[PDB]
Write a protein that binds this ligand. Structure first.
Ligand SMILES: Nc1ncnc2c1ncn2[C@@H]1O[C@H](COP(=O)(O)OP(=O)(O)O)[C@@H](O)[C@H]1O
Ligand SMILES: [K+]
Ligand SMILES: [K+]
Ligand SMILES: [K+]
Ligand SMILES: [K+]
Ligand SMILES: [K+]
Ligand SMILES: [Mg+2]
Lengths: 190, 27, 676, 557
């Protein structure tokens, strides 16, 4: 047998379906049901968008709640080139980066424990991370409490209110959405 | 990259070809 | 057989190095180690010559230990071949004296003349008297005497080989005791089974069993794996720093590849053939022997195979309407001219009971109807009206052709005779029947215990008999077999072998008759009886010599021991390689990778001592597993899963822990001797 | 922590078997040429339109059909990716690819490996990542399922020298197993916060005021088949670490379930097709024991972590470098072992910032041949090759003829099984040797020391074993690296495919034998341990040197 026609017909049909029905049906269903989630979970304040609720941003200033460091290309937290540090545990470059990050965090937070959390000094896998543990958030309370004149208890209730916990205690980790927390903190304080 | 290296690579390829030929024609 | 005579070992030690110069083309696993040995020797010579600086004594010792590893593998192969050659020399025989008497008339017509036996063609009759060795295979057509099969079989026992019936075969090389015999040249000399088995082992025509080709493919694949790992190990260390030398890579490759099974596989095959022949059963091809391990049914003949043959009558029985002299006169001439054992038995018993001196062979002539195994009929007709004899079914269907009504009291009598355990024989008075002749058969001893052992092993023994239904039950009750196939035409076994073959099962059987020859030729594992025709001898792929109907248990012992030993050595050679890694990999990278010394779980002295100890163990495990390959590993009749578990526990974790202790002992011995 | 990890393994395996039990009967129905409970004439009118019938063709035509479909797909991918800017739906106006990058990505998406040498959001357009990526993910998954379906049909069919029809197999698999389950998975991803749109890159001003460009596009439709068919390669560079790809732990758990759904369902389909489910559960035990051992070892290694962090003023010694924060270290370890064992290129962590032993174990699972819940059919026929080796060795040990499921294993089966075993490690070792002998190969290095050779060996192993997950520190965008990897992936997958089809065609010519007394039971703990030991020793005696020069050297340093 030769059979060039059924091979081509099968390929054209299974390209047409999986490239013009299933992605189109998925897009139509997503935009018709869950548009805010499907469009990027953007926080829209006015004519401009402050950011997405998942991708995270960079907070250099001491007033805001700092997140995990990013190893993206050019500026940190750049979504045009995602990825991690790709540095092994036996890398002196990673050693200097870790030491510099610990020194910077200890200089920024004098009224805290010297045992810096691992998340605030280690780069994330994607480089676009919007989550830290509430233990690290409790460690980062005093810098914000010194920068802006609010209560430690008030910050604790705000962070617990903005703490997305997983459905099961151990399927993931308890985390806080950093960008939304900072935006809501700014909106509530001013 | 050198004469000894290419000689060793050639000898390894000869042994690999002989072993593949023996696997095909173990008879 | 003697495992290692010093004379034959030092005789074959030259043949060990005769197979060294490029005769290992057909062995790829050891051609790899021979190429590595030559490469290490050449680099050691060039290394001591001034170029490629380093410690040339270590490379020279490595080259020498690979060379004597090759020598040990060739020693295993040559020792197996020498054992087979010694067995062939023991089974040469006495027949070199070609003093044969050329006979002209096909009877006892004198004609005693000394002629060479090299011109003996098919169709030439030879007659020799007692006390002289018979030249070739003999199918006696008339006569019968006592022979001595010691030099051919292995034991001396008075056996009587008559003519006419199934037990009319004598093999050349057997002395004669009492009376002259008649030798019929059915096969040309040099083409008999004895010449075939003594000539195949001389030449190197070793047609490998398909299991052996498959395992050779697997071992070649393992060699490819280890060759690629060794070859690609060089650029990794070259990038990491100072590259490893060629000789350490060759030593690691040799310690890695399956040298043990790859050098002992041919020794396993040849020694298994030698042990096969050592059980007085001969196999012309191992392809059937390797498949003989996977058998489940055994088909056995009764008349002449399980029983001793020579059915002798015990007592006549009369009927309601017949006298005894009327039995005797028909019985003495029913098979008077036949050379059948039952015919001679009824003649001698009739003459002992009545002494009726009737016509000696015939009045003037007769019909002389032969006995066919399919119709079971014989008769002589000169003065009466078509009087005959035969089995129960044949006599009944002749009654339906002649008399119609059959005596039910005689049917009850043959039923009670069958329950007693005598093979029935009914003759014809011409229109009606007179009764049965009871033939009290005698059976060979030990078959009950051997069939119990076969049932323990799991081979379903089936009786094949065409005598009577109740006789099969009576012979099965005292022998211990499974369900039989009684009252069967000899074509039923020909249908049944193909029936069991078409079901996916592998069928095996035994036989001696000429009618059984298609079944011997078509069966998978078909041993040939020693007291059997040359047609059955050439049809069966194997031949027995002990005249035992249940040598198949020894056949499957040899086949299963072959497969067990070969697979066990394979798994041992697989399990050696993790200890080979733990000996060489920490040793191979010392200056370039100083942090790899933490993997010395054996705590060896120096890296060179570790590599040398690994190569010494690679040679020593082969030379220590030569006796295991010669003997064959231990086999017991058990569950297949339990046997797999036992083989795993012996040649798995056990064959993993042996190289650790061996390498540690060799390294300690090297340290205390102070060489390295 | 150890109890939490053990609970994670237990609940993941439990819900995996729960979701794989109904799929096993359906896949068995697909193997046995039995139509679905639906299919009310739609299959007949579709096959009449497409010009295919309910034929029955042999192994040569089946293999030719699969190879021709894959080659036509590869050519279409290469031309589409070369001429990317001509095709519409390119809001970023990204230009056409290089010839080497286009060839590498085309071979990458047709040969189920899915190695990504680029960054997706600044490399490929929306229509490119739709048509040249998701379609070929579907087709490669369907090709793997069709090949393993033909192998199971060969094992279950007696004296029938034909092996079904590849066209009807591909059609039924693609449009009844892959598409609707991917639709449900993508809708769940959209519910949990994935991305599916076609808007241009939304400019975002941050809270502080810095510029930020958020990429968009159909991410969830890619992710669904990307996890269902074990076809790696994400919409973005951070493969399944981007929050636009993995928003929540529920999404990550569903991704794990989608990865392990099809190999477990294929084992269950083997058990249902072959009558007794003991032969389908022996394989699952053989996968599960090695999987649990590797997951526990990697979790222990990652929990012990890096002592340098605790020495440098950090409370936690757990190595969370290059890891997500919404995803725990135990979850990252489990997902890493899952993707490195099941030929999925998803990377929850960058796999390079792991500990040396915790990168040694998943790369060893890569190098053993991708059998432990491996690939999409590609792991199950490799496991079948290992089962043929195991039954040959077991028949040698018991003295019986080597047989499996009533089929006597012959010299042709041993030849082709040995060739299929040898295709992957010869390519891994030769590619690693060729990469480490060239300055172009070694100039993609990032981490100095033996971890760099670990990166190169992981790259070549993930290539030739068709996995696609990377340490990502290797700068594999060079033309030499792209051509070498593309060659390794292509000849590896198709030179394992061809002898597997040849074994299937050698087994259709034979006939099954009824199991009797004294045969070898091909189940139970003894045979499970024998098969696991065979797989472990074949994967170890090949690669203990390379592992000892790489991650073991780094760990002992
Ligand atoms: N010489 C003979 N003449 C007549 N009938 C015979 C003779 N030999 C055997 N029979 C009958 O034929 C049957 C032999 O069957 P079977 O065992 O198949 O052949 P064999 O004894 O030659 O092996 C016996 O039952 C016997 O009654
Ligand atoms: K192998
Ligand atoms: K594979
Ligand atoms: K594969
Ligand atoms: K990837
Ligand atoms: K392997
Ligand atoms: Mg007979």
């Amino acid at each position: 047998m030769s059979g060039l026609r059924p091979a081509l017909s099968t390929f054209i049909f299974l390209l047409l379906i999986t490239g013009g029905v299933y992605p189109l049906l998925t897009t139509v269903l997503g935009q018709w049901w869950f548009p805010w989630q499907a469009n990027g979970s953007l926080i829209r304040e006015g004519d401009t968008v402050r950011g997405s609720a998942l991708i995270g941003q960079n907070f250099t200033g001491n007033g805001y709640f700092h997140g995990r460091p990013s190893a993206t290309a050019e500026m940190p937290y750049n979504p045009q080139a995602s990825g991690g540090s790709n540095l092994a545990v036996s890398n002196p470059e990673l050693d200097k980066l870790i030491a510099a990050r610990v020194a910077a965090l200890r200089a920024a937070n004098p009224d805290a424990s010297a045992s810096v959390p691992v998340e605030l000094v280690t780069a994330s896998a994607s480089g676009l991370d919007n989550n830290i543990t509430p233990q690290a958030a409790a460690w980062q309370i005093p810098r914000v409490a010194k920068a802006r004149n609010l209560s430690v208890e008030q910050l604790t209730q705000l962070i617990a209110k903005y703490s997305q916990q997983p459905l099961v205690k151990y399927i993931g980790q308890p985390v806080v959405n950093i960008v939304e927390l900072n935006l809501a903190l700014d909106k509530l304080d001013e | 990259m050198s004469a000894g290296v290419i000689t060793g690579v050639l000898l390894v390829f000869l042994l690999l070809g002989y072993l593949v030929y023996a696997l095909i024609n173990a008879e | 057989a003697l495992f290692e005579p010093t004379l034959v070992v030092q005789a074959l030690k030259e043949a060990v190095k005769k197979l060294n110069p490029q005769a290992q083309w057909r062995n790829p696993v050891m051609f790899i180690v021979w190429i590595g040995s030559l490469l290490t020797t050449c680099i050691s010579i060039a290394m001591a010559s001034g170029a490629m600086p380093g410690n040339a004594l270590f490379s020279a010792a490595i080259s020498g230990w690979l060379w004597i590893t090759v020598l040990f593998a060739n020693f295993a192969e040559a020792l197996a071949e020498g054992r087979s050659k010694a067995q062939a020399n023991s089974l040469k025989g006495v027949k070199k004296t070609a003093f044969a008497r050329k006979l002209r008339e096909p009877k006892y017509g004198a004609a005693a003349d000394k002629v060479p036996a090299d011109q003996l063609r098919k169709g030439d009759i030879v007659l020799v008297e007692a006390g002289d060795i018979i030249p070739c295979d003999g199918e006696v057509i008339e006569g019968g005497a006592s022979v001595d099969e010691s030099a051919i079989t292995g034991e001396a026992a008075p056996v009587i080989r008559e003519s006419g019936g199934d037990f009319a075969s004598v093999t050349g090389g057997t002395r004669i005791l009492s009376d002259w015999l008649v030798i019929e040249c059915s096969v040309n000399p040099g083409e008999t089974f004895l010449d075939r088995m003594i000539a195949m082992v001389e030449g190197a025509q070793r047609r490998k069993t398909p299991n052996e080709i498959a395992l050779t493919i697997l071992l070649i694949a393992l060699t490819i794996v280890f060759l690629l790992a060794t070859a690609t190990l060089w650029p990794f260390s070259a990038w990491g720093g100072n590259a490893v030398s060629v000789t350490v890579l060759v030593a690691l490759l040799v310690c890695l590849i399956p040298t043990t099974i790859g050098g002992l596989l041919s020794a396993i095959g040849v020694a298994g053939m030698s042990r096969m022949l050592g059980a007085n059963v001969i196999a012309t091809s191992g392809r059937a022997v390797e498949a003989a391990g996977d058998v489940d049914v055994l088909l056995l003949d009764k008349t002449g195979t399980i029983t001793l043959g020579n059915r002798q009558a015990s007592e006549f029985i009369p009927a309601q309407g017949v006298d005894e002299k009327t039995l005797a006169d028909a019985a003495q001439l029913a098979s008077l001219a036949d050379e059948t054992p039952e015919g001679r038995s009824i003649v001698i018993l009739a003459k002992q009971r009545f002494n009726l001196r009737e016509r000696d062979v015939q009045s003037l002539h007769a019909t002389f109807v032969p006995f066919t195994a399919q119709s079971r009929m014989s008769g002589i007709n000169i003065d009466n009206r078509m009087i005959r004899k035969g089995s129960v079914d044949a006599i009944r269907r002749h009654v339906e052709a002649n008399g119609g009504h059959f005596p039910t009291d005689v049917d009850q009598k043959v039923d009670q005779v069958a329950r007693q355990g005598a093979t029935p024989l009914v003759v014809v008075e011409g229109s009606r029947v007179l009764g049965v002749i009871a033939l009290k058969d005698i059976v060979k001893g030990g078959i009950k215990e051997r069939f119990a052992q076969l049932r323990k092993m799991g081979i379903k023994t089936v009786m094949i008999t065409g005598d009577n239904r109740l006789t099969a039950a009576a012979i099965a009750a005292e022998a211990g077999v499974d369900d039989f196939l009684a009252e069967a035409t000899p074509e039923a076994k020909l249908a049944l072998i193909r029936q069991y073959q078409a079901e996916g099962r592998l069928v095996a059987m035994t036989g001696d008759g000429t009618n059984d020859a298609p079944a011997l030729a078509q069966a998978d594992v078909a041993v040939a009886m020693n007291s059997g025709t040359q047609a059955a001898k050439e049809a069966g792929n194997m031949v027995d010599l002990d005249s035992n109907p249940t040598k198949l248990i020894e056949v499957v012992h040899i086949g299963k021991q072959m497969l067990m030993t070969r697979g066990s050595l394979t798994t041992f050679s697989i399990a050696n390689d993790v200890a080979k890694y733990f000996a060489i990999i920490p040793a191979a990278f010392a200056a370039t990778y100083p942090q790899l010394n933490a993997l010395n779980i054996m705590c060896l002295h120096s890296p060179d001592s570790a590599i040398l100890s690994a190569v010494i163990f690679n040679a020593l495990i082969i030379v220590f597993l030569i006796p295991l390959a010669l003997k064959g590993v231990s086999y017991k009749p058990l569950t297949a899963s339990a046997m797999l578990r036992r083989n795993l526990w012996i040649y798995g974790l056990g064959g993993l822990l042996v190289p650790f202790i061996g390498i540690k002992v060799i390294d300690l011995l090297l340290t205390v001797c102070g060489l390295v | 922590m150890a109890a939490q990890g053990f609970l994670l393994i237990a609940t993941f395996l439990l819900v995996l078997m729960v979701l794989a039990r109904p799929l096993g009967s359906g896949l068995a129905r697909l193997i046995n040429d039995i139509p679905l409970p639906g299919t009310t004439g739609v299959e007949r009118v579709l096959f009449r339109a497409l010009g295919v019938s309910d034929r029955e063709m042999n192994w040569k035509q089946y293999l030719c059909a699969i190879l021709g479909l894959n080659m036509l797909g590869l050519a279409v991918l290469f031309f589409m990716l070369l001429g990317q800017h001509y095709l519409p739906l390119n809001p970023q106006q990204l230009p056409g690819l290089s010839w080497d990058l286009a060839l590498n990505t085309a071979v990458s998406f047709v040969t189920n490996t899915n190695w990504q040498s680029y960054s997706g959001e600044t490399t490929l357009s929306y229509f490119s990542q739709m048509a040249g990526l998701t379609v070929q993910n579907f087709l490669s998954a369907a090709s793997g399922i069709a090949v393993i379906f033909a192998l199971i049909r060969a094992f279950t069919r007696q004296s029938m020298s034909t092996l079904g029809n590849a066209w009807v197999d591909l059609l039924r698999i693609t449009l009844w197993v892959l598409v609707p389950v991917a639709l449900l998975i993508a809708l769940f991803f959209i519910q949990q916060g994935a991305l599916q749109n076609f808007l241009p890159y939304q400019a975002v001003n941050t809270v502080e005021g810095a510029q930020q460009l958020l990429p968009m596009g159909p991410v969830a439709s890619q992710e669904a088949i990307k996890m269902l068919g074990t076809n790696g390669g994400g919409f973005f560079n951070a493969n399944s670490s981007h929050p636009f790809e993995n928003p929540t732990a529920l999404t990550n758990f569903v991704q794990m379930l989608a990865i392990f759904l099809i190999p477990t369902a294929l084992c269950f389909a083997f058990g249902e097709v072959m009558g007794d489910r003991r032969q389908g559960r022996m394989l699952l035990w053989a996968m599960s024991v090695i999987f649990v051992i590797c997951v526990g070892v990697v979790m222990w290694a990652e929990v012990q972590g890096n002592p340098h962090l605790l020495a440098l003023g950090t409370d936690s010694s757990i190595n969370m470098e290059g890891k997500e924060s919404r995803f725990g270290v135990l979850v990252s370890s489990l997902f890493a072992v899952v993707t490195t064992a099941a030929s999925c290129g998803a990377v929850i962590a960058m796999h390079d910032s792991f500990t040396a032993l915790g990168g040694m174990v998943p790369m060893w699972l890569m190098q053993i041949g991708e059998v432990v819940f491996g690939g999409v059919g590609s792991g199950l026929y490799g496991m079948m090759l290992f089962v043929l080796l195991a039954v040959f060795i077991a028949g040698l040990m018991i003295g019986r003829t080597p047989e499996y499921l009533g089929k006597k294993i012959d010299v042709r089966e041993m030849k082709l099984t040995a060739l299929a075993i040898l295709v992957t490690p010869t390519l891994v070792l030769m590619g690693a040797a060729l990469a480490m002998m060239t300055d172009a190969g070694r100039s993609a290095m990032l981490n100095p020391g033996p971890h760099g050779f670990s990166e190169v060996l992981y790259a070549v192993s993930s290539a030739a074993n068709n996995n696609g997950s990377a340490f990502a520190g290797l700068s594999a965008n060079s033309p030499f690296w792209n051509c070498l990897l593309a060659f390794c992936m292509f000849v590896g997958r198709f030179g394992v495919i061809i002898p597997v089809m040849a074994i299937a065609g050698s087994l259709v010519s034979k006939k099954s034998q009824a199991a009797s007394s004294g045969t070898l039971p091909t189940h139970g703990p003894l045979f499970v341990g024998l098969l696991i030991g065979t797989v472990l020793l074949v994967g170890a005696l090949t690669f203990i040197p390379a592992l000892a020069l790489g991650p073991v050297a780094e760990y002992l340093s």
